[PDB]
PDB file of C-alpha atoms (C1' of nucleotides) and ligand atoms in Angstrom:
ATOM      1  CA  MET A 215      97.832 109.615  64.472  1.00 13.17           C
ATOM      2  CA  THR A 216      95.519 111.040  61.812  1.00 14.04           C
ATOM      3  CA  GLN A 217      95.286 110.373  58.071  1.00 14.03           C
ATOM      4  CA  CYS A 218      96.831 112.325  55.220  1.00 12.97           C
ATOM      5  CA  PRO A 219      94.172 112.951  52.544  1.00 14.82           C
ATOM      6  CA  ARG A 220      96.891 112.467  49.905  1.00 14.82           C
ATOM      7  CA  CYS A 221      99.140 109.472  50.729  1.00 11.88           C
ATOM      8  CA  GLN A 222      96.445 108.155  53.133  1.00 13.09           C
ATOM      9  CA  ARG A 223      99.150 107.247  55.627  1.00 11.45           C
ATOM     10  CA  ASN A 224      98.396 107.292  59.347  1.00 11.59           C
ATOM     11  CA  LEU A 225     100.684 109.885  60.839  1.00 11.48           C
ATOM     12  CA  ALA A 226     101.562 111.787  64.015  1.00 14.77           C
ATOM     13  CA  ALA A 227     100.755 115.521  64.308  1.00 16.25           C
ATOM     14  CA  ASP A 228     104.483 116.280  63.709  1.00 12.91           C
ATOM     15  CA  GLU A 229     104.195 115.006  60.069  1.00  8.80           C
ATOM     16  CA  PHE A 230     101.637 117.734  59.417  1.00  9.15           C
ATOM     17  CA  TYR A 231     101.895 121.547  59.030  1.00  6.94           C
ATOM     18  CA  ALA A 232     100.688 124.164  61.569  1.00 10.10           C
ATOM     19  CA  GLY A 233      98.927 126.419  59.054  1.00  9.33           C
ATOM     20  CA  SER A 234      96.044 125.725  56.678  1.00  5.49           C
ATOM     21  CA  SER A 235      97.626 123.064  54.431  1.00  7.89           C
ATOM     22  CA  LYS A 236      96.048 119.625  54.909  1.00  8.49           C
ATOM     23  CA  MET A 237      98.588 117.251  53.242  1.00  9.07           C
ATOM     24  CA  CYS A 238     101.575 115.792  55.181  1.00  4.92           C
ATOM     25  CA  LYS A 239     105.199 117.066  54.989  1.00  2.00           C
ATOM     26  CA  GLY A 240     106.241 114.081  52.827  1.00  2.22           C
ATOM     27  CA  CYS A 241     103.433 114.715  50.354  1.00  2.00           C
ATOM     28  CA  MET A 242     104.155 118.457  50.259  1.00  2.00           C
ATOM     29  CA  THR A 243     107.920 117.932  49.863  1.00  2.03           C
ATOM     30  CA  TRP A 244     107.218 115.427  47.097  1.00  2.00           C
ATOM     31  CA  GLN A 245     104.893 117.931  45.264  1.00  5.12           C
ATOM     32  CA  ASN A 246     107.561 120.653  45.643  1.00  4.65           C
ATOM     33  CA  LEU A 247     110.334 118.291  44.393  1.00  2.00           C
ATOM     34  CA  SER A 248     108.390 117.390  41.219  1.00  2.00           C
ATOM     35  CA  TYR A 249     107.330 120.993  40.479  1.00  2.00           C
ATOM     36  CA  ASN A 250     110.902 122.304  41.116  1.00  2.00           C
ATOM     37  CA  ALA A 251     112.552 119.545  39.019  1.00  2.00           C
ATOM     38  CA  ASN A 252     110.273 120.285  36.075  1.00  2.00           C
ATOM     39  CA  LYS A 253     110.815 124.090  36.365  1.00  2.00           C
ATOM     40  CA  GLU A 254     114.605 123.834  36.748  1.00  2.00           C
ATOM     41  CA  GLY A 255     115.124 121.082  34.155  1.00  2.00           C
ATOM     42  CA  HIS A 256     116.415 118.579  36.728  1.00  2.00           C
ATOM     43  CA  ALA A 257     115.874 114.842  36.268  1.00  2.00           C
ATOM     44  CA  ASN A 258     113.966 112.912  38.949  1.00  2.00           C
ATOM     45  CA  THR A 259     114.423 109.154  39.410  1.00  2.00           C
ATOM     46  CA  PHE A 260     112.522 108.976  42.760  1.00  2.00           C
ATOM     47  CA  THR A 261     109.011 107.535  42.661  1.00  2.00           C
ATOM     48  CA  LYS A 262     106.620 108.862  45.338  1.00  2.00           C
ATOM     49  CA  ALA A 263     106.877 105.521  47.206  1.00  2.00           C
ATOM     50  CA  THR A 264     110.701 105.422  47.307  1.00  2.00           C
ATOM     51  CA  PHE A 265     110.734 109.118  48.196  1.00  2.00           C
ATOM     52  CA  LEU A 266     108.329 108.676  51.141  1.00  2.00           C
ATOM     53  CA  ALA A 267     110.393 105.768  52.516  1.00  2.00           C
ATOM     54  CA  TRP A 268     113.541 107.873  52.023  1.00  2.00           C
ATOM     55  CA  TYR A 269     112.049 110.965  53.705  1.00  2.00           C
ATOM     56  CA  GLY A 270     111.014 108.888  56.761  1.00  2.00           C
ATOM     57  CA  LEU A 271     109.354 110.602  59.725  1.00  2.00           C
ATOM     58  CA  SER A 272     109.679 114.039  61.331  1.00  2.00           C
ATOM     59  CA  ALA A 273     111.400 113.065  64.634  1.00  2.00           C
ATOM     60  CA  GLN A 274     114.097 111.111  62.744  1.00  2.00           C
ATOM     61  CA  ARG A 275     115.017 113.928  60.330  1.00  2.00           C
ATOM     62  CA  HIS A 276     118.209 115.987  60.830  1.00  2.00           C
ATOM     63  CA  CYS A 277     120.122 118.160  58.382  1.00  2.00           C
ATOM     64  CA  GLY A 278     123.005 116.045  56.926  1.00  2.00           C
ATOM     65  CA  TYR A 279     125.295 119.098  57.142  1.00  2.00           C
ATOM     66  CA  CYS A 280     124.668 120.877  60.493  1.00  2.00           C
ATOM     67  CA  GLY A 281     122.796 118.105  62.360  1.00  2.00           C
ATOM     68  CA  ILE A 282     119.836 120.329  63.345  1.00  2.00           C
ATOM     69  CA  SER A 283     116.634 118.318  64.032  1.00  2.00           C
ATOM     70  CA  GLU A 284     113.501 119.210  62.093  1.00  2.00           C
ATOM     71  CA  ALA A 285     111.899 120.621  65.307  1.00  2.00           C
ATOM     72  CA  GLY A 286     115.060 122.661  66.002  1.00  2.00           C
ATOM     73  CA  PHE A 287     114.930 124.128  62.506  1.00  2.00           C
ATOM     74  CA  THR A 288     111.216 124.883  62.877  1.00  2.00           C
ATOM     75  CA  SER A 289     112.116 126.804  66.048  1.00  2.00           C
ATOM     76  CA  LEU A 290     114.280 129.228  63.993  1.00  2.00           C
ATOM     77  CA  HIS A 291     111.146 130.569  62.210  1.00  2.00           C
ATOM     78  CA  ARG A 292     112.723 130.787  58.779  1.00  2.00           C
ATOM     79  CA  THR A 293     110.458 131.807  55.915  1.00  2.00           C
ATOM     80  CA  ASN A 294     110.244 130.216  52.444  1.00  2.00           C
ATOM     81  CA  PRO A 295     110.165 132.493  49.335  1.00  2.00           C
ATOM     82  CA  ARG A 296     106.398 132.980  49.719  1.00  2.00           C
ATOM     83  CA  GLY A 297     107.253 133.591  52.715  1.00  2.00           C
ATOM     84  CA  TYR A 298     105.547 131.263  55.170  1.00  2.00           C
ATOM     85  CA  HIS A 299     107.160 129.576  58.215  1.00  2.00           C
ATOM     86  CA  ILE A 300     109.407 126.598  57.222  1.00  2.00           C
ATOM     87  CA  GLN A 301     108.496 123.445  59.135  1.00  2.00           C
ATOM     88  CA  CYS A 302     110.435 120.611  57.492  1.00  2.00           C
ATOM     89  CA  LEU A 303     113.876 119.707  56.139  1.00  2.00           C
ATOM     90  CA  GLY A 304     114.332 119.528  52.358  1.00  2.00           C
ATOM     91  CA  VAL A 305     116.576 117.695  49.940  1.00  2.00           C
ATOM     92  CA  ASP A 306     119.934 118.869  48.668  1.00  2.00           C
ATOM     93  CA  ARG A 307     121.051 117.651  45.199  1.00  2.00           C
ATOM     94  CA  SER A 308     124.446 117.000  46.695  1.00  2.00           C
ATOM     95  CA  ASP A 309     126.171 117.224  43.266  1.00  2.00           C
ATOM     96  CA  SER A 310     124.512 120.481  42.198  1.00  2.00           C
ATOM     97  CA  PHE A 311     124.992 119.616  38.520  1.00  2.00           C
ATOM     98  CA  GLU A 312     122.856 116.410  38.871  1.00  2.00           C
ATOM     99  CA  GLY A 313     119.131 116.004  39.519  1.00  2.00           C
ATOM    100  CA  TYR A 314     116.960 114.271  42.131  1.00  2.00           C
ATOM    101  CA  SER A 315     117.794 110.606  42.804  1.00  2.00           C
ATOM    102  CA  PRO A 316     118.370 108.358  45.854  1.00  2.00           C
ATOM    103  CA  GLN A 317     122.124 108.395  45.069  1.00  2.00           C
ATOM    104  CA  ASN A 318     122.270 112.224  44.726  1.00  2.00           C
ATOM    105  CA  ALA A 319     119.781 113.292  47.471  1.00  2.00           C
ATOM    106  CA  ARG A 320     120.811 114.357  50.936  1.00  2.00           C
ATOM    107  CA  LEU A 321     118.564 115.775  53.668  1.00  2.00           C
ATOM    108  CA  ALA A 322     119.437 119.404  54.349  1.00  2.00           C
ATOM    109  CA  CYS A 323     117.916 122.369  56.263  1.00  2.00           C
ATOM    110  CA  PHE A 324     117.057 125.410  54.045  1.00  2.00           C
ATOM    111  CA  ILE A 325     119.870 127.401  55.702  1.00  2.00           C
ATOM    112  CA  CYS A 326     122.575 124.887  54.765  1.00  2.00           C
ATOM    113  CA  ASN A 327     120.983 124.259  51.374  1.00  2.00           C
ATOM    114  CA  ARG A 328     121.182 127.944  50.370  1.00  2.00           C
ATOM    115  CA  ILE A 329     124.671 128.334  51.863  1.00  2.00           C
ATOM    116  CA  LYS A 330     125.945 125.409  49.819  1.00  2.00           C
ATOM    117  CA  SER A 331     124.078 126.776  46.778  1.00  2.00           C
ATOM    118  CA  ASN A 332     126.005 125.662  43.691  1.00  2.00           C
ATOM    119  CA  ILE A 333     129.252 126.940  45.204  1.00  2.00           C
ATOM    120  CA  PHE A 334     130.488 124.212  47.603  1.00  2.00           C
ATOM    121  CA  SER A 335     130.855 120.453  47.083  1.00  2.00           C
ATOM    122  CA  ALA A 336     129.150 118.178  49.596  1.00  2.00           C
ATOM    123  CA  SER A 337     132.483 117.433  51.322  1.00  2.00           C
ATOM    124  CA  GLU A 338     133.374 121.167  51.525  1.00  2.00           C
ATOM    125  CA  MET A 339     129.849 121.659  52.893  1.00  2.00           C
ATOM    126  CA  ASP A 340     130.395 118.921  55.541  1.00  2.00           C
ATOM    127  CA  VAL A 341     133.083 121.196  57.020  1.00  2.00           C
ATOM    128  CA  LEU A 342     130.834 124.329  56.795  1.00  2.00           C
ATOM    129  CA  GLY A 343     128.107 122.228  58.435  1.00  2.00           C
ATOM    130  CA  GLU A 344     130.192 121.586  61.541  1.00  2.00           C
ATOM    131  CA  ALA A 345     130.701 125.364  61.943  1.00  2.00           C
ATOM    132  CA  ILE A 346     126.975 126.002  61.502  1.00  2.00           C
ATOM    133  CA  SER A 347     126.296 123.366  64.225  1.00  2.00           C
ATOM    134  CA  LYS A 348     128.431 125.384  66.642  1.00  2.00           C
ATOM    135  CA  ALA A 349     126.208 128.408  65.977  1.00  2.00           C
ATOM    136  CA  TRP A 350     123.132 126.294  66.830  1.00  2.00           C
ATOM    137  CA  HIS A 351     124.878 124.620  69.815  1.00  2.56           C
ATOM    138  CA  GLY A 352     125.768 128.106  71.071  1.00  5.20           C
ATOM    139  CA  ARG A 353     122.171 129.333  70.634  1.00  2.80           C
ATOM    140  CA  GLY A 354     120.950 126.373  72.828  1.00  4.77           C
ATOM    141  CA  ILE A 355     119.450 124.538  69.820  1.00  5.78           C
ATOM    142  CA  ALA A 356     119.665 120.804  68.833  1.00  8.88           C
TER     143      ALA A 356
ATOM    144  CA  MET B 177     149.995 154.118  38.326  1.00 11.47           C
ATOM    145  CA  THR B 178     147.245 155.971  36.464  1.00 10.64           C
ATOM    146  CA  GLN B 179     144.643 158.473  37.673  1.00 13.19           C
ATOM    147  CA  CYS B 180     141.055 157.844  38.698  1.00 10.68           C
ATOM    148  CA  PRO B 181     138.793 160.404  36.980  1.00 14.29           C
ATOM    149  CA  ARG B 182     136.683 160.493  40.162  1.00 15.82           C
ATOM    150  CA  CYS B 183     138.876 160.613  43.306  1.00 17.97           C
ATOM    151  CA  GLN B 184     141.846 161.751  41.148  1.00 16.20           C
ATOM    152  CA  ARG B 185     144.121 159.436  43.102  1.00 11.55           C
ATOM    153  CA  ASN B 186     147.167 157.907  41.428  1.00 10.32           C
ATOM    154  CA  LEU B 187     146.630 154.180  41.501  1.00 11.50           C
ATOM    155  CA  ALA B 188     147.992 150.827  40.326  1.00 12.48           C
ATOM    156  CA  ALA B 189     146.127 148.823  37.646  1.00 10.91           C
ATOM    157  CA  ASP B 190     144.837 146.487  40.422  1.00  9.78           C
ATOM    158  CA  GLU B 191     142.676 149.346  41.874  1.00  7.91           C
ATOM    159  CA  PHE B 192     140.807 149.484  38.574  1.00  9.71           C
ATOM    160  CA  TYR B 193     138.243 147.163  36.901  1.00  8.48           C
ATOM    161  CA  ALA B 194     138.878 144.917  33.851  1.00 11.39           C
ATOM    162  CA  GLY B 195     135.707 145.854  31.961  1.00 12.94           C
ATOM    163  CA  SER B 196     134.480 149.209  30.666  1.00 11.53           C
ATOM    164  CA  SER B 197     134.069 151.113  33.958  1.00 11.27           C
ATOM    165  CA  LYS B 198     136.617 153.924  34.346  1.00 11.09           C
ATOM    166  CA  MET B 199     136.411 154.786  38.099  1.00 11.67           C
ATOM    167  CA  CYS B 200     138.534 152.937  40.723  1.00  9.43           C
ATOM    168  CA  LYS B 201     137.280 150.128  43.033  1.00 10.59           C
ATOM    169  CA  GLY B 202     137.180 152.504  46.036  1.00  9.44           C
ATOM    170  CA  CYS B 203     135.092 155.040  44.135  1.00 10.83           C
ATOM    171  CA  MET B 204     132.759 152.341  42.792  1.00 12.87           C
ATOM    172  CA  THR B 205     132.378 150.675  46.211  1.00 12.69           C
ATOM    173  CA  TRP B 206     131.682 154.085  47.727  1.00 13.32           C
ATOM    174  CA  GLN B 207     128.969 154.843  45.062  1.00 12.09           C
ATOM    175  CA  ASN B 208     127.424 151.393  45.685  1.00 16.55           C
ATOM    176  CA  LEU B 209     127.525 151.895  49.502  1.00 14.41           C
ATOM    177  CA  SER B 210     125.684 155.247  49.295  1.00 12.94           C
ATOM    178  CA  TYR B 211     123.087 154.011  46.769  1.00 12.09           C
ATOM    179  CA  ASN B 212     122.485 150.777  48.785  1.00 14.87           C
ATOM    180  CA  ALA B 213     122.245 152.623  52.141  1.00 12.72           C
ATOM    181  CA  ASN B 214     119.664 155.030  50.744  1.00 15.67           C
ATOM    182  CA  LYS B 215     117.622 152.195  49.114  1.00 18.03           C
ATOM    183  CA  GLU B 216     117.710 149.941  52.195  1.00 14.64           C
ATOM    184  CA  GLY B 217     117.176 152.703  54.775  1.00 13.91           C
ATOM    185  CA  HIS B 218     120.586 152.163  56.400  1.00 16.54           C
ATOM    186  CA  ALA B 219     122.451 155.042  58.042  1.00 14.60           C
ATOM    187  CA  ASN B 220     125.925 155.959  56.761  1.00 15.60           C
ATOM    188  CA  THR B 221     128.447 157.789  58.959  1.00 15.72           C
ATOM    189  CA  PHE B 222     131.435 157.262  56.582  1.00 14.09           C
ATOM    190  CA  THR B 223     132.540 160.260  54.532  1.00 16.90           C
ATOM    191  CA  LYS B 224     134.157 159.436  51.163  1.00 17.04           C
ATOM    192  CA  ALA B 225     137.588 160.388  52.588  1.00 19.02           C
ATOM    193  CA  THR B 226     137.353 158.164  55.694  1.00 21.42           C
ATOM    194  CA  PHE B 227     135.908 155.382  53.544  1.00 21.51           C
ATOM    195  CA  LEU B 228     138.774 155.526  51.010  1.00 22.10           C
ATOM    196  CA  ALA B 229     141.379 155.412  53.806  1.00 23.07           C
ATOM    197  CA  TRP B 230     139.444 152.521  55.382  1.00 23.33           C
ATOM    198  CA  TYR B 231     139.139 150.593  52.095  1.00 22.56           C
ATOM    199  CA  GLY B 232     142.916 150.894  51.488  1.00 23.75           C
ATOM    200  CA  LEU B 233     144.466 149.252  48.425  1.00 25.33           C
ATOM    201  CA  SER B 234     143.721 146.086  46.444  1.00 25.92           C
ATOM    202  CA  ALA B 235     146.783 143.964  47.413  1.00 23.93           C
ATOM    203  CA  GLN B 236     146.138 144.589  51.136  1.00 23.97           C
ATOM    204  CA  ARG B 237     142.457 143.560  51.084  1.00 26.00           C
ATOM    205  CA  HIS B 238     141.345 140.154  52.442  1.00 25.81           C
ATOM    206  CA  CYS B 239     137.917 138.963  53.536  1.00 28.31           C
ATOM    207  CA  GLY B 240     137.696 139.354  57.371  1.00 27.68           C
ATOM    208  CA  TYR B 241     135.864 136.005  57.563  1.00 32.15           C
ATOM    209  CA  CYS B 242     137.586 133.517  55.190  1.00 30.00           C
ATOM    210  CA  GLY B 243     140.893 135.360  54.605  1.00 28.86           C
ATOM    211  CA  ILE B 244     140.677 135.192  50.783  1.00 29.09           C
ATOM    212  CA  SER B 245     142.718 137.954  49.060  1.00 28.27           C
ATOM    213  CA  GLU B 246     140.942 140.241  46.614  1.00 22.27           C
ATOM    214  CA  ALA B 247     142.864 138.623  43.685  1.00 19.76           C
ATOM    215  CA  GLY B 248     141.923 135.145  44.973  1.00 20.04           C
ATOM    216  CA  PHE B 249     138.262 136.132  45.084  1.00 20.73           C
ATOM    217  CA  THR B 250     138.483 137.638  41.593  1.00 24.98           C
ATOM    218  CA  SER B 251     139.828 134.263  40.427  1.00 28.00           C
ATOM    219  CA  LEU B 252     136.545 132.564  41.482  1.00 30.84           C
ATOM    220  CA  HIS B 253     134.632 134.491  38.757  1.00 32.86           C
ATOM    221  CA  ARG B 254     131.585 135.225  40.876  1.00 32.54           C
ATOM    222  CA  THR B 255     128.903 137.406  39.322  1.00 34.43           C
ATOM    223  CA  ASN B 256     127.056 140.332  40.952  1.00 36.25           C
ATOM    224  CA  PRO B 257     123.229 140.584  40.571  1.00 35.09           C
ATOM    225  CA  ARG B 258     123.623 142.280  37.175  1.00 33.27           C
ATOM    226  CA  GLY B 259     125.596 139.838  36.706  1.00 32.97           C
ATOM    227  CA  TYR B 260     129.101 141.002  35.857  1.00 36.24           C
ATOM    228  CA  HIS B 261     132.383 139.520  37.184  1.00 35.41           C
ATOM    229  CA  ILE B 262     133.102 140.578  40.826  1.00 36.24           C
ATOM    230  CA  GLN B 263     136.573 142.073  41.200  1.00 35.98           C
ATOM    231  CA  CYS B 264     136.716 143.561  44.701  1.00 34.94           C
ATOM    232  CA  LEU B 265     135.817 142.818  48.325  1.00 33.38           C
ATOM    233  CA  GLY B 266     132.830 144.636  49.846  1.00 30.59           C
ATOM    234  CA  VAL B 267     131.733 145.727  53.287  1.00 32.02           C
ATOM    235  CA  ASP B 268     129.694 143.699  55.737  1.00 30.29           C
ATOM    236  CA  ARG B 269     127.500 145.613  58.246  1.00 30.65           C
ATOM    237  CA  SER B 270     128.754 143.254  60.902  1.00 33.30           C
ATOM    238  CA  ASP B 271     125.691 143.897  63.136  1.00 31.38           C
ATOM    239  CA  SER B 272     123.091 143.398  60.400  1.00 28.43           C
ATOM    240  CA  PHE B 273     120.585 145.574  62.268  1.00 27.05           C
ATOM    241  CA  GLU B 274     122.949 148.632  62.122  1.00 22.75           C
ATOM    242  CA  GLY B 275     124.073 150.723  59.150  1.00 22.13           C
ATOM    243  CA  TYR B 276     127.402 151.706  57.572  1.00 22.35           C
ATOM    244  CA  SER B 277     130.003 153.147  59.968  1.00 24.76           C
ATOM    245  CA  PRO B 278     133.718 152.617  60.749  1.00 26.74           C
ATOM    246  CA  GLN B 279     132.696 150.811  63.975  1.00 27.51           C
ATOM    247  CA  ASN B 280     130.169 148.524  62.191  1.00 24.52           C
ATOM    248  CA  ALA B 281     132.000 147.881  58.859  1.00 24.70           C
ATOM    249  CA  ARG B 282     134.070 144.810  58.162  1.00 25.46           C
ATOM    250  CA  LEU B 283     135.663 143.815  54.846  1.00 25.15           C
ATOM    251  CA  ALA B 284     134.007 140.693  53.466  1.00 24.66           C
ATOM    252  CA  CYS B 285     133.966 138.739  50.157  1.00 26.88           C
ATOM    253  CA  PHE B 286     130.487 138.507  48.500  1.00 30.31           C
ATOM    254  CA  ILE B 287     130.385 134.761  49.264  1.00 31.66           C
ATOM    255  CA  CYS B 288     130.834 135.233  53.018  1.00 34.28           C
ATOM    256  CA  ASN B 289     128.624 138.322  53.013  1.00 33.98           C
ATOM    257  CA  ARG B 290     125.643 136.438  51.533  1.00 32.57           C
ATOM    258  CA  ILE B 291     126.277 133.379  53.722  1.00 30.66           C
ATOM    259  CA  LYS B 292     126.213 135.520  56.847  1.00 29.95           C
ATOM    260  CA  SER B 293     123.147 137.347  55.482  1.00 24.49           C
ATOM    261  CA  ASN B 294     121.122 138.525  58.482  1.00 24.06           C
ATOM    262  CA  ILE B 295     121.277 135.044  60.007  1.00 23.11           C
ATOM    263  CA  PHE B 296     124.683 134.768  61.754  1.00 25.82           C
ATOM    264  CA  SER B 297     126.423 137.161  64.156  1.00 27.07           C
ATOM    265  CA  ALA B 298     129.944 138.262  63.264  1.00 30.70           C
ATOM    266  CA  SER B 299     131.443 135.878  65.855  1.00 29.08           C
ATOM    267  CA  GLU B 300     129.339 132.929  64.568  1.00 29.03           C
ATOM    268  CA  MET B 301     130.499 133.969  61.087  1.00 33.62           C
ATOM    269  CA  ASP B 302     134.178 133.971  62.214  1.00 36.68           C
ATOM    270  CA  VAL B 303     133.778 130.215  62.779  1.00 35.09           C
ATOM    271  CA  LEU B 304     131.988 129.697  59.395  1.00 37.72           C
ATOM    272  CA  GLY B 305     134.803 131.742  57.834  1.00 41.24           C
ATOM    273  CA  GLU B 306     137.477 129.303  58.978  1.00 43.33           C
ATOM    274  CA  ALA B 307     135.544 126.446  57.305  1.00 42.00           C
ATOM    275  CA  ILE B 308     135.180 128.456  54.093  1.00 43.98           C
ATOM    276  CA  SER B 309     138.981 129.071  54.158  1.00 45.25           C
ATOM    277  CA  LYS B 310     139.540 125.308  54.148  1.00 49.31           C
ATOM    278  CA  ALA B 311     137.457 125.073  50.966  1.00 49.97           C
ATOM    279  CA  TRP B 312     139.680 127.739  49.351  1.00 48.33           C
ATOM    280  CA  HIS B 313     142.892 126.203  50.794  1.00 50.50           C
ATOM    281  CA  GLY B 314     141.780 122.860  49.341  1.00 48.38           C
ATOM    282  CA  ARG B 315     141.063 124.426  45.925  1.00 47.99           C
ATOM    283  CA  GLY B 316     144.679 125.835  45.870  1.00 44.47           C
ATOM    284  CA  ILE B 317     143.474 129.422  46.462  1.00 44.13           C
ATOM    285  CA  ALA B 318     144.839 132.133  48.860  1.00 47.22           C
TER     286      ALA B 318
ATOM    287  C1'  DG C  19     131.760 162.658  33.890  1.00 48.67           C
ATOM    288  C1'  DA C  20     127.678 161.588  37.272  1.00 49.38           C
ATOM    289  C1'  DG C  21     122.824 158.651  38.062  1.00 49.14           C
ATOM    290  C1'  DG C  22     119.953 155.017  38.411  1.00 52.18           C
ATOM    291  C1'  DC C  23     119.491 150.646  37.837  1.00 53.81           C
ATOM    292  C1'  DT C  24     118.342 144.619  39.215  1.00 53.69           C
ATOM    293  C1'  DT C  25     118.798 141.077  42.258  1.00 55.56           C
ATOM    294  C1'  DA C  26     122.903 133.765  42.612  1.00 54.14           C
TER     295       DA C  26
ATOM    296  C1'  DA D  92     119.044 139.184  52.909  1.00 52.46           C
ATOM    297  C1'  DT D  93     123.000 140.147  51.554  1.00 53.36           C
ATOM    298  C1'  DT D  94     125.187 143.536  47.843  1.00 53.10           C
ATOM    299  C1'  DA D  95     128.103 145.063  43.055  1.00 51.33           C
ATOM    300  C1'  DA D  96     130.175 146.496  37.798  1.00 48.42           C
ATOM    301  C1'  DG D  97     128.933 147.622  33.584  1.00 47.35           C
ATOM    302  C1'  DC D  98     125.233 150.131  30.513  1.00 47.97           C
ATOM    303  C1'  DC D  99     122.548 153.739  28.938  1.00 43.43           C
ATOM    304  C1'  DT D 100     120.734 158.158  29.678  1.00 44.99           C
ATOM    305  C1'  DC D 101     121.678 162.593  30.973  1.00 46.99           C
TER     306       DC D 101
ATOM    307  C1'  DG E   2      91.054 117.268  46.567  1.00 45.16           C
ATOM    308  C1'  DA E   3      94.803 118.553  42.888  1.00 43.29           C
ATOM    309  C1'  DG E   4      97.629 122.802  40.287  1.00 47.00           C
ATOM    310  C1'  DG E   5     100.314 126.557  39.772  1.00 47.83           C
ATOM    311  C1'  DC E   6     102.450 129.845  41.840  1.00 48.61           C
ATOM    312  C1'  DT E   7     107.192 133.546  43.672  1.00 52.65           C
ATOM    313  C1'  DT E   8     111.668 133.895  45.035  1.00 55.77           C
ATOM    314  C1'  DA E   9     115.823 135.860  52.058  1.00 55.81           C
TER     315       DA E   9
ATOM    316  C1'  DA F  85     121.332 129.372  43.234  1.00 56.01           C
ATOM    317  C1'  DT F  86     119.291 127.169  46.300  1.00 57.18           C
ATOM    318  C1'  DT F  87     114.108 125.721  47.334  1.00 55.35           C
ATOM    319  C1'  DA F  88     109.073 125.565  50.230  1.00 58.15           C
ATOM    320  C1'  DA F  89     103.798 126.206  52.625  1.00 60.42           C
ATOM    321  C1'  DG F  90      99.866 128.430  52.218  1.00 62.93           C
ATOM    322  C1'  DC F  91      96.287 130.632  48.789  1.00 62.78           C
ATOM    323  C1'  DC F  92      93.173 130.778  45.185  1.00 62.10           C
ATOM    324  C1'  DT F  93      91.367 128.703  41.211  1.00 61.72           C
ATOM    325  C1'  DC F  94      89.727 124.718  39.295  1.00 62.74           C
TER     326       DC F  94
HETATM  327 CA1   CA G 408     121.263 121.921  47.200  1.00 60.58          CA
HETATM  328 CA1   CA G 409     126.598 141.791  55.628  1.00 61.92          CA
HETATM  329 ZN1   ZN G 410     100.812 112.431  52.789  1.00 59.03          ZN
HETATM  330 ZN1   ZN G 411     121.781 122.577  58.264  1.00 56.76          ZN
HETATM  331 ZN1   ZN G 412     138.644 156.721  42.533  1.00 56.35          ZN
HETATM  332 ZN1   ZN G 413     135.080 135.308  52.602  1.00 57.28          ZN
END
DNA sequence: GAGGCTTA
DNA sequence: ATTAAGCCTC
DNA sequence: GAGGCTTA
DNA sequence: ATTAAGCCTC
């Protein structure tokens, strides 16, 4: 446990980043969500408080398509567009025509999220997800 | 049958594009392959002649991952980066660390090709491909 | 008729 | 990261 | 400590 | 098209 200078929550080391950012993963994902929604013209019905309760804690997070844990995904050393090492799971607007909301949000790893893109429906992606999980299972990753 | 001003082959309408380009799909895919290989620093052991025999004809082409026919893929109205309507299947460098060669080339639709990216091996992608095929099968597409 | 491009 | 068809000179 | 970014 | 963590002002 230490304290996030932003939400002031008391959190385990696994809720924080490994590089030089000081805010927690929930705070950072919330700042990204709001900036992305504005830029992309998506609606956002989450408040920070509902989002943070929705996002939960690092050891409980798994991609809702492939099942990979947040630590497992971290171990793949994927890079974001900037491109720094990706260390948390993000949110998929499961209906890609709708915005951010509790009803429309689904936790997804950045690999599944980009695969799904705006091409596959969430149920089509559930089936892709199972195939992706076999890749991970084969690589010795959970 | 009409004649491609480039390879001078006598070809069915389905070997040609629907927009304003005059060269056949084989010729265009060959010009793309050579330009992309140069730009990306990939080797290319195909000659035009071996490539054209490898690429075959439109009605015989199916993605080697998801099984979608070239006409089926055309019916999805995907756009290339330019972005015009995609009307043929391309080649996947199945080992993404190696270049273009008969041994390393595999026919793939642009959807499977981008999914695979440099993330999945060809055998991991075979399993993703089967899941993608179910999406198509469900959409009434072959 | 060929060349060089821009990037979901 | 993976490519792909029409445009706009030459 | 918060803001605005660039894009496999 | 889909997003995501560190940098560099403020
Ligand atoms: Ca999504
Ligand atoms: Ca490929
Ligand atoms: Zn926080
Ligand atoms: Zn996933
Ligand atoms: Zn030709
Ligand atoms: Zn395919």
